[PDB]
Design a protein around this nucleic acid. Structure first.
Ligand SMILES: [K+]
Ligand SMILES: [K+]
Ligand SMILES: [K+]
Ligand SMILES: [K+]
Ligand SMILES: [K+]
Ligand SMILES: [K+]
Ligand SMILES: [K+]
Ligand SMILES: [K+]
Ligand SMILES: [K+]
Ligand SMILES: [K+]
Ligand SMILES: [K+]
Ligand SMILES: [K+]
Ligand SMILES: [K+]
Ligand SMILES: [K+]
Ligand SMILES: [K+]
Ligand SMILES: [K+]
Ligand SMILES: [K+]
Ligand SMILES: [K+]
Ligand SMILES: [K+]
Ligand SMILES: [K+]
Ligand SMILES: [K+]
Ligand SMILES: [K+]
Ligand SMILES: [Mg+2]
Ligand SMILES: [Mg+2]
Ligand SMILES: [Mg+2]
Ligand SMILES: [Mg+2]
Ligand SMILES: [Mg+2]
Ligand SMILES: [Mg+2]
Ligand SMILES: [Mg+2]
Ligand SMILES: [Mg+2]
Ligand SMILES: [Mg+2]
Ligand SMILES: [Mg+2]
Ligand SMILES: [Mg+2]
Ligand SMILES: [Mg+2]
Ligand SMILES: [Mg+2]
Ligand SMILES: [Mg+2]
Ligand SMILES: [Mg+2]
Ligand SMILES: [Mg+2]
Ligand SMILES: [Mg+2]
Ligand SMILES: [Mg+2]
Ligand SMILES: [Mg+2]
Ligand SMILES: [Mg+2]
Ligand SMILES: [Mg+2]
Ligand SMILES: [Mg+2]
Ligand SMILES: [Mg+2]
Ligand SMILES: [Mg+2]
Ligand SMILES: [Mg+2]
Ligand SMILES: [Mg+2]
Ligand SMILES: [Mg+2]
Ligand SMILES: [Mg+2]
Ligand SMILES: [Mg+2]
Ligand SMILES: [Mg+2]
Ligand SMILES: [Mg+2]
Ligand SMILES: [Mg+2]
Ligand SMILES: [Mg+2]
Ligand SMILES: [Mg+2]
Ligand SMILES: [Mg+2]
Ligand SMILES: [Mg+2]
Ligand SMILES: [Mg+2]
Ligand SMILES: [Mg+2]
Ligand SMILES: [Mg+2]
Ligand SMILES: [Mg+2]
Ligand SMILES: [Mg+2]
Ligand SMILES: [Mg+2]
Ligand SMILES: [Mg+2]
Ligand SMILES: [Mg+2]
Ligand SMILES: [Mg+2]
Ligand SMILES: [Mg+2]
Ligand SMILES: [Mg+2]
Ligand SMILES: [Mg+2]
Ligand SMILES: [Mg+2]
Ligand SMILES: [Mg+2]
Ligand SMILES: [Mg+2]
Ligand SMILES: [Mg+2]
Ligand SMILES: [Mg+2]
Ligand SMILES: [Mg+2]
Ligand SMILES: [Mg+2]
Ligand SMILES: [Mg+2]
Ligand SMILES: [Mg+2]
Ligand SMILES: [Mg+2]
Ligand SMILES: [Mg+2]
Ligand SMILES: [Mg+2]
Ligand SMILES: [Mg+2]
Ligand SMILES: [Mg+2]
Ligand SMILES: [Mg+2]
Ligand SMILES: [Mg+2]
Lengths: 77, 51, 64, 96
RNA sequence: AAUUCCUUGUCGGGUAAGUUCCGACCUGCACGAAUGGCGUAAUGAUGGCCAGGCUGUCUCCACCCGAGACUCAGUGAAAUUGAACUCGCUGUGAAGAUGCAGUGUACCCGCGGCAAGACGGAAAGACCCCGUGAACCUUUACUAUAGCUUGACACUGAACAUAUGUUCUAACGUUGACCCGUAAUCCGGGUUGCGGACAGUGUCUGGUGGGUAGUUUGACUGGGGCGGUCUCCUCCUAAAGAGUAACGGAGGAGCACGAAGGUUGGCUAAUCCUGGUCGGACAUCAGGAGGUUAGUGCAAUGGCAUAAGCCAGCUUGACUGCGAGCGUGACGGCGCGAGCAGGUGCGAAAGCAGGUCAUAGUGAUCCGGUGGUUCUGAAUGGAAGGGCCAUC
RNA sequence: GUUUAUUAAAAACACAGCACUGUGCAAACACGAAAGUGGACGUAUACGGUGUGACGCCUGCCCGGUGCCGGAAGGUUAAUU
RNA sequence: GUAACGGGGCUAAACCAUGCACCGAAGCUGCGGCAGCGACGCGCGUUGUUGGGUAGGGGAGCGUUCUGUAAGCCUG
RNA sequence: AGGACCGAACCGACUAAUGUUGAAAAAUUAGCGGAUGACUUGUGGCUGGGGGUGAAAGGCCAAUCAAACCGGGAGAUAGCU
RNA sequence: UUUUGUAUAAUGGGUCAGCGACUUAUAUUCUGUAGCAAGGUUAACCGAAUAGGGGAGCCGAAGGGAAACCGAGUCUUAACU
RNA sequence: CCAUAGGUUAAUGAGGCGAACCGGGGGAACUGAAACAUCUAAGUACCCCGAGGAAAAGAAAUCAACCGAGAUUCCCCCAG
């Protein structure tokens, strides 16, 4: 007859906006994410929704770093 | 919801107010906070009033 | 006869120097307490009509 | 303006502003217009006689638009800082 | 049962055999007392059932008499019709073929017959759905409204008594009587009686008002209806960027919090084992094992130890103006944001703070309200109203 | 008896009878912006409306709901002021 | 109505493997012609390339009646 | 005596067959009901369209009826063919 | 013609001839073309006057701001990097 | 009872028709609003009355804005 499902939320367009080696202007969003899947490295800020954004003009650099092998995003300015 | 809107009115007599919500039942004491009044351009005591 | 202005559009849009239209932002009439100051502050200045909408505005305002 | 029944743009946006009655009776005079009046006195009446401004204009302002190269007396009109410099540069007077 | 779904109920009668009929039973799905109950002689082109008679109704048709049909002479229609050199079959194919393929059959043309096909003719399917179509009907749908009804004021006055009561006459009524116009009963005038400021009518006003009128009465949908659904968040479907459907599979939201926010300083979980007043499986205490299997104000996912988890001090950055740049949207919008100015909190300081681990907790515009602001102010000064800012 | 002229003649409609109810006469009611007219040249043994439907035996319980009828102390309440 | 190779027929004219022939389209090439677009030269040549089309957009024309040109021109 | 009986005229229309580009836009043929009555019929009159009239079928109101016909608003509107 | 798709057994047409459907007015924008050019152009009207007159107007050469107002700037803000 | 109503006679005028235009008394709905009620259509269609060669309007208890204009009517602007 009827079903109790049939709901879903709008897709949030998360994920990587600027990949490795891409030249960005300061302020450019590099990744939108839920929590810190990626962490802010050098010249990268972490917004209130865990958005990583460039704090300097330069090139995006993904790196695995530290004792937990966490993924950091940096900007090579 | 439960929480009702209030205005925080400037003690400087500028007319300037902030607005916020308040659970009136759990907290009946008047909300008082130092907030920036942009008319006098100073932090002054703001006090709760009706919206 | 003369085309009639859509008078509601004339109250919402003003033509700018290069033939664009400025309008006031939606969402700043009421239900303001819940809105962030940042959000409301960005809604205060007038904005330009987007490319998708200029055709609709121009149709409504032949004497703008 | 019909969008298929979606609230159209000219209704989902707020009305703003009011129309000034004073703006309708206010004009702007270019520096180029100053040499088009007869006699080299630029008043409200001399501009109206030269068909620079409409007959119902009560207020007029000379702006720095175009150029002036004659001594013109400007009387009873507002003048911009740039227009005033240009009028005075060409030997004119701004009478208020 | 004109009512009984189950049901051809069951029992009895009638028949060789009876879902009907008649008589009962009561288990009345869902009789029932004037939208009458139960009877009832008579009546009925009324419904059901049985029997005698009667018969071509039938077994099962035969023959005959007439009117057509058939032939000749005369007259002379019609519906229909893209064009036709207009076969069968099996297959194919807008899925049921004269027309395609393959194959079989078939000399050319009438006439009388028959209706299997030409999805034959006839009527832009009446069912069904759709259209923000129509009509008429209904009502405790909406909005009106005739009518009915309420009061105020008017036409409408006078005494006396304590806004009401009584009395009065002169307005007003009279579809009482009489007189005259008059040859008329209508009507008007006159006289007189009876009512009498009442009634009645106008304007305004509350009620009532399917009597009447105009209309509304959503969409999605494996047809429609019924049910469910409609915005927002999380996961999966989703094919390792983004996005991605179904009445696909699972759950949540329509808040909470002046601390559960800011900052400084500090801290680290579940669970179990061993021992220990009451005390048990589980309370609190002690040690160890363990290593987040906990925790997160609330779903799920992604996060989280430098904790984002837990505790305390001091606090109001849950600041105001802005904003390089970027994300995400058809758009309206929504989001992230360093940095700048002002002023602030915490910290010795570096610093951190423009709410909350993040992602739901929402509503355009119009209309109007409140506060601020001489921006505007229809001769002028004001004001009203409008604008702008804040907010409802 | 009546009825769907032209697919329904009936169990439908009507009917005498019954009941409820309104109506005091310028009747109620109806047709009429109104004047008037019907009701009726009638007058409650009359007239209108409604339901039932010869006759026989009868017609039980419920007034909470919706109407209607009566009440009106009090609550609420229009124009007006 | 054969009716589950399209048929005839087939013991290969079936299937598998290998190989070389050939047939086969409006594909490609040849020859002649037309047009679009673009070069490179001087509207012409040379040369490259393109030319299936519904909705639909763009470009360029034919013919018809009428007015001027026309009291002209053609026409018993 | 009788909305009494049988049955012609007269009024009707229950059944069947025919007819269905009819002889006929409702009939013919054989049967059928009423036939002194709430009967039937001639002539004339009155009622008018949200109106009439209706022993009530939404029947009938000129072969037209859940709102006649004619003319007008009028080229209504038609997101449909 | 309509369609995802029609020899379709979906639609329309018996045939011929004639007629039969994107117009007209005004406004507005864009393109082409012509005139004039920081100007361009007149409307009614006058004029027998397609002339000539008529520049009332309209558009343009300045914008910004809700507005006062300022003006190659302006608005925003106490003030802008 | 005066009188009046009423009655008769005389004179004068009216009556009816007509396409539009005009002034007045009444006055829709379809339609549009993508439904619909406010609103629209529209004071339109239509009905009625009255007039004239035209009608109506008209000689400021009008505008204006501190300057001024000078009855009414009609046309172009103002201005979608
Ligand atoms: K980016
Ligand atoms: K029953
Ligand atoms: K009853
Ligand atoms: K064949
Ligand atoms: K046949
Ligand atoms: K009297
Ligand atoms: K009275
Ligand atoms: K009603
Ligand atoms: K479906
Ligand atoms: K199905
Ligand atoms: K805290
Ligand atoms: K700061
Ligand atoms: K009968
Ligand atoms: K009761
Ligand atoms: K009618
Ligand atoms: K179809
Ligand atoms: K068909
Ligand atoms: K054009
Ligand atoms: K041009
Ligand atoms: K600037
Ligand atoms: K209407
Ligand atoms: K519509
Ligand atoms: Mg998701
Ligand atoms: Mg690490
Ligand atoms: Mg506001
Ligand atoms: Mg001028
Ligand atoms: Mg049964
Ligand atoms: Mg039985
Ligand atoms: Mg039995
Ligand atoms: Mg038998
Ligand atoms: Mg029985
Ligand atoms: Mg019953
Ligand atoms: Mg009863
Ligand atoms: Mg009965
Ligand atoms: Mg076949
Ligand atoms: Mg034959
Ligand atoms: Mg036959
Ligand atoms: Mg057929
Ligand atoms: Mg059809
Ligand atoms: Mg109704
Ligand atoms: Mg309507
Ligand atoms: Mg409707
Ligand atoms: Mg639907
Ligand atoms: Mg993906
Ligand atoms: Mg992928
Ligand atoms: Mg897609
Ligand atoms: Mg914290
Ligand atoms: Mg927290
Ligand atoms: Mg949270
Ligand atoms: Mg309004
Ligand atoms: Mg004033
Ligand atoms: Mg004034
Ligand atoms: Mg009978
Ligand atoms: Mg019949
Ligand atoms: Mg019959
Ligand atoms: Mg009477
Ligand atoms: Mg009965
Ligand atoms: Mg009873
Ligand atoms: Mg066989
Ligand atoms: Mg070839
Ligand atoms: Mg080729
Ligand atoms: Mg080709
Ligand atoms: Mg081509
Ligand atoms: Mg010619
Ligand atoms: Mg008899
Ligand atoms: Mg009859
Ligand atoms: Mg007979
Ligand atoms: Mg009899
Ligand atoms: Mg008889
Ligand atoms: Mg019926
Ligand atoms: Mg008839
Ligand atoms: Mg009707
Ligand atoms: Mg019309
Ligand atoms: Mg039409
Ligand atoms: Mg189909
Ligand atoms: Mg084909
Ligand atoms: Mg087919
Ligand atoms: Mg066909
Ligand atoms: Mg065929
Ligand atoms: Mg069709
Ligand atoms: Mg056909
Ligand atoms: Mg300007
Ligand atoms: Mg006359
Ligand atoms: Mg509509
Ligand atoms: Mg006159
Ligand atoms: Mg004066």
């Amino acid at each position: 007859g009827s079903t109790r499902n049939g709901r879903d939320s709008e897709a949030k367009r998360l994920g990587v906006k600027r990949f490795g080696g891409e030249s960005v202007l300061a302020g450019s969003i590099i990744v939108r994410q839920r929590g810190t899947k990626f962490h802010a490295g050098a010249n990268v800020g972490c917004g209130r929704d865990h958005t990583l954004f460039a704090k300097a003009d330069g090139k995006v650099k993904f790196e695995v770093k530290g004792p937990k092998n966490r993924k950091f995003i940096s900007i090579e300015a | 919801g439960i929480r009702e809107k209030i205005k925080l009115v400037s003690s400087a007599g500028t007319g300037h107010f902030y607005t916020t919500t308040k659970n009136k039942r759990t907290k009946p004491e008047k909300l008082e906070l130092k907030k920036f009044d942009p008319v006098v351009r100073q932090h002054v005591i703001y006090k709760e009033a009706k919206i | 006869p003369k085309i009639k202005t859509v008078r509601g559009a004339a109250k919402r849009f003003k033509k700018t120097g290069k033939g664009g239209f400025k309008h006031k932002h939606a969402n700043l009439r009421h239900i303001l307490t819940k809105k962030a100051t940042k959000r409301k502050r960005h809604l205060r200045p007038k904005a330009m009509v987007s490319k998708g909408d200029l055709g609709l505005v121009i149709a409504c305002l032949p004497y703008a | 303006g019909f969008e298929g029944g979606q609230m159209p743009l000219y209704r989902r946006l707020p009305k703003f502003g009011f129309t000034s009655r004073k703006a309708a009776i206010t004009a702007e005079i270019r520096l180029s217009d100053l040499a088009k009046v007869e006699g080299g006195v630029v008043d409200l009446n001399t501009l109206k006689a030269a068909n620079i401004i409409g007959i119902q204009i009560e207020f007029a302002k000379v702006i720095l638009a175009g150029e002036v190269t004659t001594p013109v007396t400007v009387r009873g009109l507002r003048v911009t800082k740039g227009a005033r410099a240009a009028i005075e540069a060409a030997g004119g007077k701004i009478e208020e």
